[PDB]
Design a protein around this ligand. Structure first.
Ligand SMILES: *[C@@H]1O[C@H](CO[C@@H]2O[C@@H](C)[C@@H](O)[C@@H](O)[C@@H]2O)[C@@H](O[C@@H]2O[C@H](CO)[C@@H](O)[C@H](O)[C@H]2NC(C)=O)[C@H](O)[C@H]1NC(C)=O
Ligand SMILES: *[C@@H]1O[C@H](CO)[C@@H](O[C@@H]2O[C@H](CO)[C@@H](O)[C@H](O)[C@H]2NC(C)=O)[C@H](O)[C@H]1NC(C)=O
Ligand SMILES: *[C@@H]1O[C@H](CO)[C@@H](O[C@@H]2O[C@H](CO)[C@@H](O)[C@H](O)[C@H]2NC(C)=O)[C@H](O)[C@H]1NC(C)=O
Ligand SMILES: *[C@@H]1O[C@H](CO)[C@@H](O[C@@H]2O[C@H](CO)[C@@H](O)[C@H](O)[C@H]2NC(C)=O)[C@H](O)[C@H]1NC(C)=O
Ligand SMILES: *[C@@H]1O[C@H](CO)[C@@H](O[C@@H]2O[C@H](CO)[C@@H](O)[C@H](O)[C@H]2NC(C)=O)[C@H](O)[C@H]1NC(C)=O
Ligand SMILES: *[C@@H]1O[C@H](CO)[C@@H](O[C@@H]2O[C@H](CO)[C@@H](O)[C@H](O)[C@H]2NC(C)=O)[C@H](O)[C@H]1NC(C)=O
Ligand SMILES: *[C@@H]1O[C@H](CO)[C@@H](O)[C@H](O)[C@H]1NC(C)=O
Ligand SMILES: *[C@@H]1O[C@H](CO)[C@@H](O)[C@H](O)[C@H]1NC(C)=O
Ligand SMILES: *[C@@H]1O[C@H](CO)[C@@H](O)[C@H](O)[C@H]1NC(C)=O
Ligand SMILES: *[C@@H]1O[C@H](CO)[C@@H](O)[C@H](O)[C@H]1NC(C)=O
Ligand SMILES: *[C@@H]1O[C@H](CO)[C@@H](O)[C@H](O)[C@H]1NC(C)=O
Lengths: 421, 323, 119, 49
């Protein structure tokens, strides 16, 4: 601890005092994982390997829920030309849980795949499939010129070429009413400035890559306070209590001393929150019991030292900490019980508690002070406020000075500081 | 405040980014430490003015003046006076939420028992020795005789005290009773101390609530960003939280430094009132209450001092022709 | 202004004890005041009374305080034991002896009487 | 100073972004209000003696 003071003071010599070096922390003993006990594998196969996809103007959506996923199978498939995730990392995606997942699928030109991203614009993004600005899913696309094109041209897939206004995020429009491009009404028939709003793609197998068909699948994941109906393949560990441990409840990851909670959670509630919005309590996804999440204890480590010009002995104060918590900072050789004293300021270690009282040499707090005294050791004591004195008052007695002393005393006051620019 | 725990919590990933900002966390901890050390200095300079812990005699024959409401009550472990208990009960907020987020409250050096023992010694020296314990050794003098000296100090002949001693004693006892009754009844009297407690509680609640702000990041929960994004993308989101959280600490520490100056000025004033109103008799108009100052008695209060100023107010004036 | 250019009655403003005078000394970015003060010492106990009852008159000190060495009564200044005989010149009369709590009986010398007696 | 009008003026688009900074605008308004109230206290204690 003395070397830590020297280090934090950036000095090889330390004057008498109490120096707040570093913070103590109880580190986690082990890591807990608690995902839902769901065995049902998620049906991703039937959205990626479907024989025929939907037209992008009428993009299909399939809800994925109450199942266990394995996104590593998808990402490691290497069959996809584009695999872009927004707000979620592709590799970490398998180590997380989601409340619901929606798989959207459609076919578009290779040149249009760039429009399937948040904040995009263009015929597809504006009139066929719009992603929100704060999208949290993944966009996956691959060339399908082996399935969706034929000699003479495949016209199975349509897209909306004209619309009155841009689509809202995840909006779908299946209307076939003829678009009026001019002031003259169309009366339900095509003509000048009157065009059918859907146009068919011309997919020939010999067309350039920018004109070839591409199958697109968009996986939208939603994170909410609601229970996690979809989660990755991680196996849940056993549950331990009253010990500092890392935890991972339905993806909620943190560290604390999990304890049985008296909090009367209503049947719909899943989490409890702190003023800082950190999770304060949680419902176990398997046993449905409520657990408190108080953090593993921390406190300032103050090193009490006479000047190094006097001695290299030091005492250590773990501020606010109870002496039962200090383990036997990086160093731990101090914590043995030979000199340990629970002050109201915290656990004091390496100082000798004495019943005598003296002027406050080094202030510790709550009336406790420390000093280096005799065989020398660092003692800790309740400070003396002054010498006790009974004035000898009486209703008819007076004390009058028969002499005097002329005293000269020195008062020092700062007047200025160095002028800096 | 552990600047690293407030900004980054448990995350080492965030802690490594916080190092890129350098000395800012050391500056914040150093500033808050200077403030904390000054609070002990402020208390010491106000209360530790008495050099010896004077005790009152067992026979309280003070000439009819009754100090029982202000002298220590031996029946209590706190050893506070009756009025000191009223003050403490009248003055004395998300403390557990604050604690869990890297914030901590350090105990003062002098306990309330020690501060009550200083006000006890200051009060005992005053009634048993007048102003003599302020200038040097405590010289006993009968209380009625030192009160006669107080009358001379305001330009009233000492015979006015001795001829009206029973009336003056009764007026004093009644006036002390009015203090006891007033502090027992109204809630607004100790507003100056409550305002300091409220301002500092509000500042901490504001600092904790800023942890819920996004500052443009995808989430305010720093553990979620690390659990949901890879390093190259996570560090961009974490740097937004670091920037806004660091700005929150700088705003908090700056306002605490300014509040510390206000408390410092008030503590300097209180130390001056202790020396000039309690350890002496002040000729300075309105410095020790309205009217001509006779004497003052200090009483301890939570994070403050209460001075009971005894003054002479002339009454029932008559007109006279003069030359 | 108050400790160097004058004498301050303000307690503890210019050092401990009763302020006599102060001397300024310059220091780097600061000032050092040498405060000269009077500190009373070697106090002795004395019996005291608020007034002296003489010939039915209540006598009070003009300046000072009445003190007794155990057998005799004197008047002395409050901050330095310099006892003097209690006389009609260093005391003033106000009322009779019935109102003052703790008044003590003693003679009060009159310096005019021995002159007329001797003349 | 209306912290929201100084920073964003009439814009609601900017006002929604300013909410991401949280309490900072309330802190600024609160500090300036404390100063303003103290100016009345300063005048009262000098003249209303
Ligand atoms: C002043 O005297 C008191 C004791 O009073 C004694 O009786 C009086 C009638 C008179 O004759 C005094 O001169 C006598 O001395 C002293 O108080 C005692 O001091 C001792 C320590 O020396 C202490 O142990 C006792 O408890 C004190 N007694 C009480 C009742 O408090 C006092 O010290 C004398 N002061 C000076 C300056 O001499
Ligand atoms: C320090 O921690 C220990 C627990 O490790 C506390 O001891 C407990 O105290 C309560 C009373 O408050 C008793 O009911 C328990 O039986 C005690 N437990 C043990 C194992 O002794 C101790 O009180 C704490 N002290 C402080 C100052 O916090
Ligand atoms: C008043 O106190 C002073 C000391 O402050 C006394 O002076 C000393 O007296 C002794 C003899 O008793 C001498 O040996 C010292 O040399 C003197 N010191 C100085 C600085 O002169 C003085 O005698 C005391 N006077 C009375 C009347 O008690
Ligand atoms: C000094 O004042 C106290 C009040 O602080 C007096 O105590 C009261 O005495 C009456 C009886 O005379 C009781 O009915 C009250 O309950 C007492 N109050 C308290 C708070 O104790 C006390 O009598 C006074 N003593 C002298 C000698 O005047
Ligand atoms: C109290 O003071 C008186 C002075 O007025 C002392 O009386 C004198 O004592 C001396 C001897 O020391 C005699 O020579 C004088 O004649 C006395 N004067 C009178 C007027 O009687 C007296 O001794 C002092 N007593 C004490 C106890 O100090
Ligand atoms: C002071 O002296 C007077 C006499 O000069 C004392 O007064 C007498 O007191 C007794 C009772 O003790 C009465 O019976 C007499 O009638 C009083 N005489 C007069 C003229 O009033 C007085 O008691 C003395 N006081 C003290 C404190 O000794
Ligand atoms: C599609 O089918 C192939 C086998 O023909 C399989 O390897 C692949 O994993 C399937 N796709 C998905 C998303 O499961
Ligand atoms: C998960 O397992 C627990 C036993 O550990 C069981 O009580 C619970 O019913 C299971 N979950 C569901 C949804 O049934
Ligand atoms: C350190 O000790 C030396 C004597 O070896 C002394 O000269 C010096 O003043 C001391 N300094 C402090 C700060 O104690
Ligand atoms: C200090 O006092 C306690 C009693 O409060 C006693 O048990 C202990 O032995 C004492 N220690 C010393 C060193 O006197
Ligand atoms: C002082 O107390 C005594 C009792 O010890 C009493 O007889 C006397 O009258 C009192 N004197 C004064 C001035 O109060």
């Amino acid at each position: 601890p003395l070397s830590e003071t020297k280090c934090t003071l950036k000095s090889f010599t330390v004057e008498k005092g109490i120096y707040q070096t570093s913070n103590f922390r109880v580190q986690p003993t082990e890591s807990i994982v608690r995902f839902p006990n769901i065995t049902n594998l998620c049906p991703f196969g039937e959205v990626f390997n479907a024989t025929r996809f939907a037209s992008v103007y009428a993009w299909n959506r399939k809800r994925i829920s109450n199942c266990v996923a394995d996104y590593s199978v998808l990402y490691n498939s290497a069959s996809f030309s584009t695999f872009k995730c927004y707000g979620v990392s592709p590799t970490k995606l398998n180590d997380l849980c989601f409340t619901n997942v929606y798989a959207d699928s459609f076919v578009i030109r290779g040149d249009e795949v760039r429009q399937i991203a948040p904040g995009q614009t263009g015929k597809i993004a504006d009139y066929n499939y719009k992603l929100p600005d704060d999208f949290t899913g993944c966009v996956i696309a691959w060339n399908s010129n082996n399935l969706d094109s034929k000699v003479g041209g495949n016209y199975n897939y349509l897209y909306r070429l004209f619309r009155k206004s841009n689509l809202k995020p995840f909006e779908r429009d299946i209307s076939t009413e003829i678009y009026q491009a001019g002031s003259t009404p169309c009366n339900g028939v095509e003509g000048f400035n009157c065009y059918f709003p859907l146009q068919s793609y011309g997919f020939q197998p010999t067309n350039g890559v920018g004109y070839q068909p591409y199958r697109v699948v968009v996986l939208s994941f939603e994170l909410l306070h609601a229970p996690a109906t979809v989660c990755g393949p991680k196996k849940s560990t056993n549950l331990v209590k009253n010990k500092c441990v890392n935890f991972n409840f339905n993806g909620l990851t943190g560290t604390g001393v999990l304890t049985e909670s008296n909090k009367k959670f209503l049947p719909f509630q899943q989490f409890g929150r702190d003023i800082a919005d950190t999770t304060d309590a949680v419902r176990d996804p398997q046993t449905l019991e409520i657990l408190d999440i108080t953090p593993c204890s921390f406190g300032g480590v103050s090193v009490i030292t006479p000047g190094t010009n006097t001695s290299n002995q030091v005492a250590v104060l773990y501020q606010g900490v109870n002496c039962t918590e200090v383990p036997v900072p990086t160093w731990r050789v101090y914590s043995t019980g030979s000199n340990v004293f629970q002050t109201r300021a915290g656990c004091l270690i390496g100082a000798e508690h004495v019943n005598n009282s003296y002027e406050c040499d080094i202030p510790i707090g709550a009336g406790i002070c420390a000093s280096y005294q005799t065989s020398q050791s660092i003692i800790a004591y309740t400070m003396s406020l002054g010498a006790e004195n009974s004035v000898a008052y009486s209703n008819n007695s007076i004390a009058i000075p028969t002499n005097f002393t002329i005293s000269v005393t020195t008062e020092i006051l700062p007047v200025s500081m160095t002028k800096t620019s | 405040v552990d600047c690293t725990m407030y900004i980054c919590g448990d995350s080492t990933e965030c802690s490594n980014l916080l190092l890129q900002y350098g000395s800012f966390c050391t500056q914040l901890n150093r500033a808050l430490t200077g403030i904390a050390v000054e609070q002990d200095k402020n208390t010491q300079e106000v209360f530790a003015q008495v050099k010896q812990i004077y005790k009152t005699p067992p026979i309280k024959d003070f000439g009819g003046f009754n100090f029982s409401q202000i002298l220590p009550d031996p029946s209590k472990p706190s050893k506070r006076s009756f009025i000191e208990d009223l003050l403490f009960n009248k003055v004395t907020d998300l403390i557990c939420a604050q604690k869990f987020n890297g914030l901590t409250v350090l105990p003062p050096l002098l306990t309330d028992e020690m501060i009550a023992q200083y006000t006890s010694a200051l009060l005992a020296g005053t009634i048993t020795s007048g102003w003599t314990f302020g200038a040097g050794a405590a010289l006993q003098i009968p209380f009625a005789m030192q009160m006669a000296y107080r009358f001379n100090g305001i330009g009233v002949t000492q015979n006015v005290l001795y001829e009206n001693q029973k009336l003056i004693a009764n007026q004093f006892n009644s006036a002390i009773g009015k203090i006891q009754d007033s502090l027992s009844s109204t809630a607004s009297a100790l507003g100056k101390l409550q305002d300091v407690v409220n301002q500092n509680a509000q500042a901490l609640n504001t600092l904790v609530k800023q942890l819920s702000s996004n500052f443009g990041a995808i989430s305010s929960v720093l553990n979620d960003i690390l659990s949901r994004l890879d390093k190259v993308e996570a560090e961009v989101q974490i740097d937004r939280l670091i920037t806004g959280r660091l700005q929150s600490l700088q705003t908090y520490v700056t306002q605490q430094l300014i509040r510390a100056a206000e408390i410092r000025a008030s503590a300097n004033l209180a130390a001056t009132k202790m020396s000039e109103c309690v350890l002496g008799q002040s000729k300075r108009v309105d410095f020790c209450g309205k009217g001509y100052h006779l004497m003052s008695f200090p009483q301890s209060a939570p994070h403050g001092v209460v001075f009971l100023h005894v003054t002479y107010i002339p009454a029932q004036e008559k007109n006279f022709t003069t030359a | 202004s108050e400790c160097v250019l004058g004498q301050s009655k303000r307690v503890d403003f210019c050092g401990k004890g009763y302020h006599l005078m102060s001397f300024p000394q310059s220091a780097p970015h600061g000032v050092v005041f040498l405060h000269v003060t009077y500190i009373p010492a070697q106090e002795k106990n004395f019996t005291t009374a608020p007034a002296i009852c003489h010939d039915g008159k209540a006598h009070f000190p003009r300046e000072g305080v009445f003190v007794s060495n155990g057998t005799h009564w004197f008047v002395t200044q409050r901050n330095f034991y310099e006892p003097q005989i209690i006389t009609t010149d260093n005391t003033f009369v106000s009322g009779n002896c019935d109102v003052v709590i703790g008044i003590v009986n003693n003679t009060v010398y009159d310096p005019l009487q021995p002159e007329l007696d001797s003349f």
